[PDB]
Amino acid sequence: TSVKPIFSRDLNEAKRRVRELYRAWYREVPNTVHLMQLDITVKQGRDKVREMFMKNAHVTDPRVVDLLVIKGKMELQETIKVWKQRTHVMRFFHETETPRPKDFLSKFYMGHDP
Amino acid sequence: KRPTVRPRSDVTHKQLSAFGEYVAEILPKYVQQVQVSCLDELEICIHPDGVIPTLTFLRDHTNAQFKSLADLTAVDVPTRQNRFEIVYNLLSLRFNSRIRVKTYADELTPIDSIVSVHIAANWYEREVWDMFGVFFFNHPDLRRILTDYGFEGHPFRKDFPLTGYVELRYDDEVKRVVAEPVELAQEFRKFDLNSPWEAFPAYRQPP
Amino acid sequence: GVQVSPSGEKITHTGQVYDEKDYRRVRFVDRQKEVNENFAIDLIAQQPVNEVEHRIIACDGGGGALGHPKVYINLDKETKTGTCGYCGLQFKQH
Amino acid sequence: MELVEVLKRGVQQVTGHGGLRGLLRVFFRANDIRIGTLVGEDKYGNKYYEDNKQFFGRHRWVIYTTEMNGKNTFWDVDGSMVPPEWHRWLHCMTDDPPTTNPPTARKFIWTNHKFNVSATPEQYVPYSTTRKKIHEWVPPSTPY
Amino acid sequence: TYKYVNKKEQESEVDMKSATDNAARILMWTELIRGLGMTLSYLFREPATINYPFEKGPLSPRFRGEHALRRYPSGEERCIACKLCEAICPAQAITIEAEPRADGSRRTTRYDIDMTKCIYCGFCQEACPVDAIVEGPNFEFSTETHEELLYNKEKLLNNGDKWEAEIAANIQADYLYR
Amino acid sequence: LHHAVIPHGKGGRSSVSGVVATVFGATGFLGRYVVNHLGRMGSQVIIPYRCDVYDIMHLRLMGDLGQLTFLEWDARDKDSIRKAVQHSNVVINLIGREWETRNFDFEDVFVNIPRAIAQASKEAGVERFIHVSHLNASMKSSSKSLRSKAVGEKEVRSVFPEAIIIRPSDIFGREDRFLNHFANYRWFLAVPLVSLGFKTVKQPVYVADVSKGIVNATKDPDAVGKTFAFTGPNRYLLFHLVKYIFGMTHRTFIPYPLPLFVYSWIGKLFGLSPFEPWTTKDKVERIHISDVMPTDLPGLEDLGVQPTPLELKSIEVLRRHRTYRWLSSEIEETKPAKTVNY
Amino acid sequence: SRAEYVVTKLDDLINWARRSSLWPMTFGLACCAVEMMHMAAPRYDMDRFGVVFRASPRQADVMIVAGTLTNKMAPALRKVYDQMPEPRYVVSMGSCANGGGYYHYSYSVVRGCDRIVPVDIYVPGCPPTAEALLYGILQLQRKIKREQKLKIWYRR
């Protein structure tokens, strides 16, 4: 209620930047699969991009979306350059972590947690 | 004469209170709550719209040549809605005195950057962002410094756990250094130590 | 007090010996568990009882600043004997 | 002259370990021929020589045993074999050896020191010194 | 006060003598033969090295290394499970769990020190009001495994039963300073 | 059920599972992945080793404190095996060789050693025993290894029933001897193949799949008298498979036929070696017999693993063999192999 | 005389070589690296024992993890350990690297270098005295002295 903006009048002007960011990531992924010798396909990389976008698709405050664009631009800086490594890039895929069950009964069989 | 306790001055207290009146009456649009501690230290508190004018003033005025930035910090206080109490520690080198400038922030109420005033503040602002999440306008780089590259979180907030949310170890299956969820062989034994007896009645928060 | 159990392991002054079904005996294979032979119960019981003259006395460990904090023991009873808390030295009066 | 005196000192160093057998036994085993005053021997066989004209890192030294507790330490020499009676003197914590200033004897102090054990058996395996905290219900051996 | 390090007073004095001197500083490497002679001087000095396992560096009674739990001359266990050594241990290396000994005495059923968390600071030995745990002299207990450096009550009591002849003497030296 | 083998934790490192396991071929190629998948969820892994301690270092990690216990042993000497299985719930036999030695033959690797281990397991009183035979293991086969492995698969049942016998296909992995073995045929300027690779079918499987399968079978209440066929998907014809190997490893491809007798003699004189041989007669024989259609048996998906295609994990193995000018090449530039069903 | 005896003696010889010429790596992260320097200093000269630093890992036979190992520096440590050519050894120095040390419960610290690289010997301290690290090095020498590699080759 009558708060200040950051880089955004409201949500459409921010979704503009969001789509620009998706654009940069989609153009950047094949270069990172090549530079650092990743052992994946360009398809699943872009799928991970769209997934990590959809993880924040439930939000409406423009300031949150702007800060998320900022964080994504930082990650894109680190990934365009090779400051980070195959380790940090493959850290998104969760290639070792066993899948956390989403069923009641398996949780009941292992653990007291919901 | 009391050897165990610290000796107190008068002239420094009077000097810094007078200079607080000076800054207050000369920069009223931005100033709040000027104060001088028991130990001789001045402390000015500022509306975030006043960061650049106040810092440029204290850097470039003749009676206030605060042209060396010592620190730029932040203090997470979840009680107050504007959590982060951002601080600037400055010295003069012409009058041999220090001053403190303070302003507030939130996760979604950033502050103007200061590199146009002190170039020292580049990495300090990057650190405040890395640690607390306070975005800074018109900053050149503004990326992390201290944390890992693929790091999710702002550690020095009070709402972040000390042991973190992820943990590392090398797996032979993938031949990498994978990040795994935190799982300790020994839980950190938190201790409750605050005695239930008022030691300092001067700071007695009344009801 | 270094009696063994039917499994064959040594037992500590804290009765601790792993059960026959406990898998945590593997760590003592081609190896050994460190267990101390000099027990404190037996060695403080292998001490005399210090007759004294007064009814209240004072026990430091014996070295002053090297013992324990100076406490005082009452010796009015005759059903039993006084006993220090830090050390286990016993006392009596006649 | 001076050269002659230092060569005489060298000859004294060469001919002060028994014979060639002992000279080599010391030289190939410590890489030093330096002679000192025998301060005192150990119950295992260490020697603990001394020579105060040297500077303050070589005026005390050990010549270790060839067998401590069945290990054949002719070559596998290590610093843990110095018992605490001589640790204090060798590391220059005192100017008082245990020949003149021996330590207080106690019924619980180890009589036979042990070298460092980290790879062999006789080493330290950790474990919980506590006991079963929660006790499980032992059901009956009968039906109904 | 202050003073300059690389400030000449001023210039404008030159003669053929000074020019020849500077030109023989140049063209002969004069200021380099000085360093050469320095290193040569060091060649003919007694070196400061020591045959380590035989001759060893000097230490003090205050030196703090391995840990050990002590006893009284009666052989009685000296710790009393007061649990402030773990309260202050700034690395949370010490876990303690206690019970009555069945003699009715306050003693520990547990005393562990993860020696890969201990910063070897001595707060525990200067806080123990009975001088039960100390930080002994030893610094030669490197191991081939992590598990060996996770101590318990038995290893600490063995370190005490081992190094008491040295611990007691170093304490004998070092009290009256604490 | 002892109170210490009760599982606790969120299923990871620094937790407990109750899967105290003796893994006998732990110093190999499948055993390292098995030990990793065990330590990854929290479980004590007794690891008997005969090698030098240099070659147990990579296993020294992959487990929290005290959960990895190594003890030395010898197949000739009993009481070095009872000592290992004395406190265990599970035992996992991965012992095996691709060549005989003066001291140990194939019988004394696949038959007599599992019999001894399973005798010790039954006498100690453990609950399970996971034996690892081969998919082609048959008493009427061509190779000494495969016949010996079928004989061991039978004798293990005869001694220790209530057992689990896993029968994988030829496994591929980072340090295998299947894809690396076919890729090292570049040092010779042409690759020989019996009948040019046709009339031969291969259904390889990945190490992670077999490892997860074993690690679930040691917890599945099923699989007590069940054999398994750890095959993997996408049955392949040998010529096309080697073509895919030599495309992903972008070197070249010069195939040509060769009979089995001269290639057997080649394998023999290559196996004349005191060191680890490059090729052997039994290896050629095992390479040039097809993999059985495994659909008479459960497999992985009856155990809780979705098998991984070769095309997704082969580059991790084969980029080692590439040169510059091709090392920075992706998976999607090799026109994948042609699958068959037959 | 006998093949096994000849093999034992050849093992002794190669172990002596790898034991007497070990070339650690200039890898010092924190305070413990200063005691590593002091072990390179004249009092406890490493070069006396045939122990000289090579800044490259490929010219290095051992690494000394002297300092705190962060989540940000662990990939580099592992890349360097891989780049070292076998036979290769690791020596964890100080409570920060053996375990977590004074930072075990923090968010950017791996709670032991043994989570990332295998460790032959652990040197405890904060910091360890240079005599202590020298004890660790000579313990690594004692360890190499009993490899029996060619013996197991003969007995396979």
Ligand SMILES: CCCCCCCCCCCCCCCCCC(=O)OC[C@H](COP(=O)(O)OCCN)OC(=O)CCCCCCCCCCCCCCCCC
């Ligand atoms: C009869 C009439 C006719 C007679 C004709 C003959 C006339 C006299 C001729 C004299 C000429 C002598 C030649 C000297 C060459 C050196 C020239 C020189 O000026 O030095 C070069 C260099 C200068 O350094 P810089 O401080 O920057 O000064 C330059 C200012 N623009 O300074 C340096 O060189 C420093 C770099 C080199 C350092 C290397 C370390 C060497 C250490 C000394 C080794 C000595 C042992 C030599 C043994 C050799 C025997 C075979």
Ligand SMILES: NC(=O)C1=CN([C@@H]2O[C@H](COP(=O)(O)OP(=O)(O)OC[C@H]3O[C@@H](n4cnc5c(N)ncnc54)[C@H](OP(=O)(O)O)[C@@H]3O)[C@@H](O)[C@H]2O)C=CC1
């Ligand atoms: N391509 C494959 O790998 C396939 C393998 N299999 C089966 O998988 C199992 C393991 O395969 P893999 O892991 O490749 O085998 P490896 O050769 O990779 O390692 C096997 C283990 O067996 C041990 N070993 C071998 N011979 C002896 C012996 N005589 N005495 C004691 N220990 C011995 C070795 O110990 P050390 O190395 O220390 O001697 C090694 O750790 C085998 O049973 C094999 O039949 C089946 C199909 C495919």
Ligand code: SF4
């Ligand atoms: S010396 Fe310091 S860090 Fe070590 S156990 Fe004692 S109090 Fe803890």
Ligand code: SF4
């Ligand atoms: S060691 Fe000392 S400080 Fe620690 S619990 Fe025992 S008596 Fe208390």
Ligand code: SF4
């Ligand atoms: S263990 Fe101590 S001395 Fe060594 S790096 Fe850590 S804090 Fe520094």
Ligand SMILES: [Zn+2]
């Ligand atoms: Zn008392």
